[PDB]
Amino acid sequence: MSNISLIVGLGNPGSEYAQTRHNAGFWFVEQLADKYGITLKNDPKFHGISGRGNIEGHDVRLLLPMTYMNRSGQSVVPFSKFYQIAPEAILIAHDELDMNPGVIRLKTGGGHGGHNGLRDIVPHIGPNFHRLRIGIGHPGSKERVSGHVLGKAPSNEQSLMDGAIDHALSKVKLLVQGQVPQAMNQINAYKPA
Numbered sequence: 001m002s003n004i005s006l007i008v009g010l011g012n013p014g015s016e017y018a019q020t021r022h023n024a025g026f027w028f029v030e031q032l033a034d035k036y037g038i039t040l041k042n043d044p045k046f047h048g049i050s051g052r053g054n055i056e057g058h059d060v061r062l063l064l065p066m067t068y069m070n071r072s073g074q075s076v077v078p079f080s081k082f083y084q085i086a087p088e089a090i091l092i093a094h095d096e097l098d099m100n101p102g103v104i105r106l107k108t109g110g111g112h113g114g115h116n117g118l119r120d121i122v123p124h125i126g127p128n129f130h131r132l133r134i135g136i137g138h139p140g141s142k143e144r145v146s147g148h149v150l151g152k153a154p155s156n157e158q159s160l161m162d163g164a165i166d167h168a169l170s171k172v173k174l175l176v177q178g179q180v181p182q183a184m185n186q187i188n189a190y191k192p193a
């Protein structure tokens with residue numbers, strides 16, 4: 001059903017990418033894992049870091065692909081296939097250029113929206129998974145995007161994103177319980193200030 005049983009955080013591996021905007025998904029899932037005491041550990045068979053544990057009475061798996069962003073499907077696809085997790089039971093947290101820092105919205109379905117992590121996943125499991133879109137803002141230049149997503153946000157924008165992520169963590173209860181509509185209402189209403 002639409003109970004969430006896999007939460008994927010997208011990002012790039014390595015200390016040099018850890019604090020970049022493109023790792024917003026990693027930030028969310030890492031903080032989720034700590035909140036619920038879920039151990040994230042190297043999972044070489046699935047080219048990622050993974051964990052499993054109890055979130056609010058529900059058995060949930062967590063996955064961070066260690067493939068680099070544009071190859072995220074090399075982790076997500078075989079992982080979800082092996083555990084027989086339908087896309088409708090997957091939440092993928094990812095950075096979103098089309099929303100401001102501090103804005104966070106749940107979306108079901110649709111395309112990759114230019115996101116090359118999602119672009120590597122949608123072809124294989126289809127579009128029908130859920131996304132936690134973590135706003136990272138857009139750069140000045142339309143050609144500045146690589147420099148933006150692989151760049152570190154200013155303390156100001158970082159605080160907004162951290163606050164939004166903190167809010168989302170408080171609503172994961174609704175997601176694993178399969179009240180996706182309520183989770184959408186309460187997440188998507190978040191104002192940073």
Ligand SMILES: Nc1ccn([C@@H]2O[C@H](CO)[C@@H](O)[C@H]2O)c(=O)n1
Nearest residue numbers: 068069070071115116117146149
């Ligand atoms: N070694 C690297 C470095 C960066 N990336 C980034 O992931 C983005 C997917 O939107 C790509 O657009 C890119 O910015 C990646 O996949 N692999």
